[PDB]
Amino acid sequence: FTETGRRAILSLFVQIIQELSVNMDAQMRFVPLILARLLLIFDYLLHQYSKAPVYLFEQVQHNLLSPPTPLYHGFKEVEENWSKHFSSDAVPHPRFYCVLSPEASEDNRLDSVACDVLFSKLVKYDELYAALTALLAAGSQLDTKENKNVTALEACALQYYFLILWRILGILPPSKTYINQLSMNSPEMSECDILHTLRWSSRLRISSYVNWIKDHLIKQGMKAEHASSLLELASTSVKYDVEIVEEYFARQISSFCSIDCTTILQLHEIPSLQSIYTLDAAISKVQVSLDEHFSKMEITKNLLPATLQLIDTYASFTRAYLLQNFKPSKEKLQGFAAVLAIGSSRCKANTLGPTLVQNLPSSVQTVCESWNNINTNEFPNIGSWRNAFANDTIPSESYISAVQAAHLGTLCSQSLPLAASLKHTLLSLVRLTGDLIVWSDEMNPPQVIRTLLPLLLESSTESVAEISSNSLERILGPAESDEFLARVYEKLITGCYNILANHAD
């Protein structure tokens, strides 16, 4: 095409994206597969608006104009899941494909003419950026209730769409409105806003993106004097991170505090996947930032209670998730809860746990081993951000991307999909608690113990009880002669009394 036709097509794309995002409420429940193709085409247009790549010519020659498998550049990881679920080495029809070559994976140079068109008339860049940030939650409510299984196609489409959106959102230059929205205060922030905020606040710190930011801010009508001051006052660093994540923790605690006491929670009140991985990203960023800050070496005076409340709420969450998957009546459900509360085998202190778990005939055995076999190795390791991820410009962003990919990979499961997510987030939360308790001068024994002993002797938390054991061993006793053994025995007697007294029927 000529320049006029190409810019008209780009403006039409902008109009489509802006218009289609107005009814986000209906979009929460849809499957964004058409959206994925639209976003892929828009990404390709942004990358190669001016010229045409050579591999496109070879592909169009071989696939179409040659006499009579096609040749394309599909996503390797998405097609990995697709071929794994297809099993028998056929993969006849390619459904998840990419047009741009993988060679552009390296940091992805935006086209000058594309951004020149974007920062001009006939387009409204601020609302475009707002729509792109809002569209990140276009599949949050799909996983949510009818006991219907999530097929491979929908999970693959969700992961594909999220990867495309994340790639495109990391290339578009800043908009001044969001700079003002985040500059001197950060209110009324949603999950997608937070997810974008963490990656941006990590980006404009040391990686020399600030010059790019101010350069693009000179365009669209913001002179250098305003841009420099806004960039200077937008970030000043650990305090900002702890502030924003503390606010997010407070909001999550306020949301979950509507449920209290000890009651069995249904599946429908389990948080959706988006909130889970947003929380995981936030806590991972906090861990990285605090670790570097105290490695190079009162701000944690309020982190502790919020973290402990998060941990015990999520322990209740995973316990309820395991319980409701066991139609069983509610009374024997509470009975099973009483049995498994004192269960677990990863602690050598108790003796009944394994035997009481094993003597039940069939219900809580096959399910128990199937749920306990959910191994979370695919996630990044303990300190993998220090050795394998420190070579790049921003280790924290690489860690966030890795954990996000790990969370997104779990959607392909059909038996117990969420188990990996809950296990990993609980593990990371308790590890953060241990690190913070090591690094904090203030420490309240009763709170931490009465929120930590239930972890070790709980059957629904056995991939984590070891870490809690290590954390408690150094602060409360060597677990052999100190009062720790006495407290464990006391909890054992409490459980035995409860089971013998309440559920004798």
Place this chain on the structure above:
Amino acid sequence: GWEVAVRPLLSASYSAFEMKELPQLVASVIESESEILHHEKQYEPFYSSFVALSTHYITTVQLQSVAAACKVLIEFSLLRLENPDEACAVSQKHLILLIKGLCTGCSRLDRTEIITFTAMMKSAKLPQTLSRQKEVQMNFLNQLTSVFNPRTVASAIKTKNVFIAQNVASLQELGGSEKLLRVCLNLPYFLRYINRFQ
């Protein structure tokens, strides 16, 4: 420039012909087509020797471009056999053997002549003395505009057969039969025999 265009032949004169050196040679032959047939006297031996080496190295071994280049060379040799000028680097006999060799399996030229051809190559003065996306797009346009046969006419023999078919079709398109017969009839030495027979 033309120095970079003749570089592959200069490099290959001491070895075989590298596969990666062919498409740019074809592109250079097609690009300079408007000028190759129209030249002054003092550039002529240089272009004649260049054509000789190019044809030799083509015959020793994307098909559309090769066919177009071979047709161009056949046209050049044809009007060189019709006119022939005194200062042609390659005489009429070697032009005849060259045209035959392009229509056959390259068993006409010998080393004893290409050494002299490369010596003249070095000793001749350039027209403009010797002593990736653009080419892909051009190939795409060439494949798009016209459809190559392919099956209307193991791997080596069939590629050779299609090459010969394309070359002979190109030769017949120029009407070279009449010109060759005419040039054979009015020979300077057979003329007396023809007259005597008459």
